[PDB]
């Protein structure tokens, strides 16, 4: 049961980094998470309009998780699939998968959840229209 | 329900680091995972006997996940709860929770899973006796 | 000539972390810099009064550098020497050295330079009295 | 005295990452160093032949330093200039500068030094011909 390129709507390429490999020769399992919210926020920055610097509205990570199938190593060229699952109105949930360039099978694959808040108060908010617009653009 | 200090068998203290705090003031959600397998492996190193540098046997992270309840920021003094859930014989599952010093409530809390393999072949193996001994030592 | 514990006025202990070790077994050369401004800012926070979250005044790193003498690896217990070299009035220069516990010889050793600015304008400022007080406290 | 695109021979583009920004909104000064040896080793991997996994021969960082001129922030598109200064025969010295895409002026700029060794012994060695070949290819 290993995810596939075509199950995902948006694709970020990310350059790997020397100190991505951990001591056993392969990208540390933690790094995948960094690849996630990079992948996400990049999309959010360029399309949702936020404005992190910036924004009166910001997303927060309340939970995440990831499953690892095959190893990847610097310097290889990883690239990140992205698609939205559930989606409340102060809240969302993404599905990420990392693919090696030219492979149908995901290398690992995971999910996490954003909760949008007012920056100052950290109190939940409706997803403003422009975010919601681009967010929805990734719904299955 | 937000986990509690006494539900956990082993305790690693970890110094937070300047660049732990992300752009919105608080320790990045990713860092938690770093705190996990630090917390784990540290115990593994000192009590399972491995031997990561030298070990013919090494652990791999095949999945992990985490839920976040309250924010923490450098320079505060986090400290990490640890306990084993399930436990096969080439395989294990930890349950981690991070605690601010002193608070009864976990700040976030998560789990992940080790698979022990022969370093060279990366083929699964029986948990050698010393590991299994200290691992089991954390069983509920 | 390899620096020595007694040449340094303040001492931060820092827990090493699993993914500190790079692919060749030893704490990545980059991590040292992380250890620096952790070591610094920690002292700054607790004794200069800033206040990074809240501070109208913040420090910026305009240059740094480091020389490496002996390797260190998670899980060993490094610990960080600190002292001030030069010291203008909107500007300062620290000298850091990392020590294995206990060794008289520094493992690596480096320096870097803070420039205090008004957070908003990022325009240079006089070091406010409390900072200057604790800063000077580390002058040779 | 701020470096210029045309003073450098090779150019790595590197994607920035969410947790590159530190607490004051801009890429942490430590990250530049990660950008350095990424930039380097990538070139070394694809052209010097090593083989880090791999190699009986590996490079080590004995010193580095960096000067910061202008700030950069995720998600902007940084990209790394690269050119060799000095060059012994067990030893080398690179000059790095980071450029924002479409700027003549470097954002920061730095140097560091490799020392090649036999992996196992960590004892110096002559730069094998293929490395030396591509290394030299970057001499002023």
Which secondary-structure segment (H or E) carries B44? none
What are the distances in angstroms from CA B16 to CA B112, B125, C82, C90? 21, 35, 18, 28
Q: How far is B32 from chain D (nearest CA, A)?
A: 13
Helix/strand/coil (H/E/C) assignment for every residue in chain A: CCCEHHHCCEEEECCCCHHHECCCCCECHHHHHHHHHHHHHHHHHHHHCCCCCCCCEEEEEEEEEEEECCCCCCCCCEEEEEEEEEECCCEEEEEEEEEECCCCECCEEEEEEEEEEECCCCCECCCCHHHHHHHHCCEC
Of chain D residues 31-60, which have a CB less than 8 A from chain C? 33-34, 37, 52, 58, 60
Interface contacts A/C by beta carbons within 8 Å? 18
Token code pair at residue C134: 């604790």
Sign of CA pseudo-dihedral B53, B59, B60, B66: negative
Q: Does D28 touch chain B (CB under 8 A)?
A: yes
Q: Does B133 touch chain A (CB under 8 A)?
A: no
Of all residues in chain B, the one with the smallest CA distance to D21 is B23
Coil/strand/helix, residue C134:
helix
Q: Does C72 touch chain A (CB under 8 A)?
A: no
Largest CA distance in chain D: 45
> Which residues in chain C have their CB less than 8 angstroms from residue D29's CB?
33, 37, 61, 64
Overall domain count for chain A: 1
Q: Do the Cβ atoms of D39 and D14 come closer than 8 Å?
A: yes
Measured distance CA(B10)–CA(A133) in Å, rounded: 46
Closest CA to D85 of D58, D57, D110: D110
Q: Does B122 touch chain C (CB under 8 A)?
A: no
**Domain that residue D89 falls in:** 1-140
Asked if C15 and B13 come within 8 Å (Cβ–Cβ), the reply is yes
Give the residue carrying structure tokens 């596939």. Answer: A4
Q: Give strand pairing partners of B110.
A: B66, B96
Largest CA distance in chain A: 45
Token code pair at residue C38: 């952790």
Of all residues in chain A, the one with the smallest CA distance to D12 is A15
Closest CA to A101 of A11, A17, A7, A3: A11
Length of chain C: 140
Of all residues in chain B, the one with the smallest CA distance to C76 is B42
Asked if C22 and A25 come within 8 Å (Cβ–Cβ), the reply is no
Conformation bin of residue C49: beta by default, left when phi > 0, alpha when psi is -120 to 50:
left
Of all residues in chain C, the one with the smallest CA distance to A19 is C22
Measured distance CA(A136)–CA(B5) in Å, rounded: 40
Asked if B22 and D25 come within 8 Å (Cβ–Cβ), the reply is no
Q: Does D19 touch chain B (CB under 8 A)?
A: yes
Q: Do the Cβ atoms of B57 and B74 come closer than 8 Å?
A: no
B: neighbours with 3+ CB pairs under 8 Å?
A: A, C, D
> Which residues in chain B have their CB less than 8 angstroms from residue A64's CB?
29, 65-66
Asked if A34 and D41 come within 8 Å (Cβ–Cβ), the reply is no
Q: How far is A117 from chain B (nearest CA, A)?
A: 12
Of all residues in chain A, the one with the smallest CA distance to C24 is A23
> Which residues in chain C have their CB less than 8 angstroms from residue A18's CB?
22
What are the distances in angstroms from CA D27 to CA B137, C56, C121, D31? 43, 20, 18, 7
Measured distance CA(D78)–CA(D70) in Å, rounded: 12
Q: How far is C15 from chain B (nearest CA, A)?
A: 6
Measured distance CA(B79)–CA(B101) in Å, rounded: 7
In chain C, DSSP assigns E strands to 10-13, 57-68, 78-87, 91-100, 106-118
Measured distance CA(C45)–CA(B51) in Å, rounded: 37
Q: Do the Cβ atoms of B29 and B20 come closer than 8 Å?
A: no
Closest CA to C4 of C81, C97, C99, C105: C105
The contacts of residue D9 (CB under 8 Å, 6+ apart) are D82, D83, D84, D137, D138
Measured distance CA(B38)–CA(B18) in Å, rounded: 17
Asked if B18 and D22 come within 8 Å (Cβ–Cβ), the reply is yes
Q: Does B17 touch chain D (CB under 8 A)?
A: no
> Which residues in chain D have their CB less than 8 angstroms from residue C63's CB?
65-68
Measured distance CA(C112)–CA(C86) in Å, rounded: 11
Q: How far is C137 from chain A (nearest CA, A)?
A: 36
Give the residue carrying structure tokens 């920061």. Answer: D108
Measured distance CA(D21)–CA(D104) in Å, rounded: 23
Cite the DSSP H helix spans in C1-140: 29-43, 129-136
Of all residues in chain A, the one with the smallest CA distance to C20 is A22
CA atoms within 13 A on the CB side of D137: 12
- Report DSSP state, residue C118: E
Q: What is the CATH number of the domain that holds C112?
A: 3.10.129.10
Q: Do the Cβ atoms of B92 and B113 come closer than 8 Å?
A: yes
Which of C29, C34, C64 has its CB closest to that of D61? C29
Q: Does D12 touch chain B (CB under 8 A)?
A: no
């Amino acid at each position: 049961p290993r995810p596939l390129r075509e199950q995902y709507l948006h694709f970020q390429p990310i350059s790997t980094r020397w100190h991505d490999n951990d001591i056993y020769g392969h990208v540390n399992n933690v790094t995948y998470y960094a690849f996630f919210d990079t992948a996400v926020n990049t999309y959010l920055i360029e399309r949702g309009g936020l404005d992190i610097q910036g924004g009166e509205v910001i997303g927060l990570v309340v939970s995440s998780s990831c499953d690892y199938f095959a190893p990847v190593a610097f310097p290889q060229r990883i690239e990140m699939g992205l698609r939205v699952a559930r989606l409340g109105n102060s809240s969302v949930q993404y599905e990420l998968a990392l693919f090696l360039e030219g492979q149908r099978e995901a290398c690992a694959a995971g999910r996490f959840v954003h909760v949008f808040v007012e920056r100052r108060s950290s109190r939940p908010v409706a997803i403003p229209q422009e975010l919601r617009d681009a967010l929805a653009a990734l719904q299955s």
